[PDB]
Design a protein around this ligand. Structure first.
Ligand SMILES: *[C@@H]1O[C@H](CO)[C@@H](O)[C@H](O)[C@H]1NC(C)=O
Lengths: 51, 51
């Protein structure tokens, strides 16, 4: 019951990813578990976001 | 899309080639700056009259 979810954090976002991980810890459950793949990028770059 | 993207060298040369172009055309004198915007254009200012 593994659920793969992608994520995109703009370089320089720390507390956001922190709150993301904290959220991962608090809302974790025995039924299913989210398996995030995080990718840091330049959010203003359209090419980077597309890729 | 292949990562990391690698650009071809020739491209820069073609770019410089295009930007250095100065020609005569329907829009008048056509010339570009380093960034690619139009330069030395003539915009005819027109008014609608009865005739
Ligand atoms: C062409 O554009 C440049 C950029 O502003 C300007 O300095 C120059 O006077 C222009 N030439 C004419 C004939 O308008």
């Amino acid at each position: 019951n593994s659920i793969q979810i992608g994520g995109l954090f703009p370089r320089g976002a720390d507390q956001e990813y922190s709150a993301f991980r904290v959220g991962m810890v608090q809302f974790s459950t025995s039924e299913f578990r989210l398996t995030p793949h995080i990718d840091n990028l330049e959010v203003a770059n359209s090419f980077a976001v597309t890729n | 899309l292949a990562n990391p993207a690698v650009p071809w060298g020739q491209g820069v040369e073609i770019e410089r080639a295009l930007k250095q172009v100065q020609v005569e055309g329907l829009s008048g004198n056509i010339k570009f700056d380093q960034n690619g915007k139009r330069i030395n254009y003539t915009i005819n200012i027109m008014e609608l009259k009865t005739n």
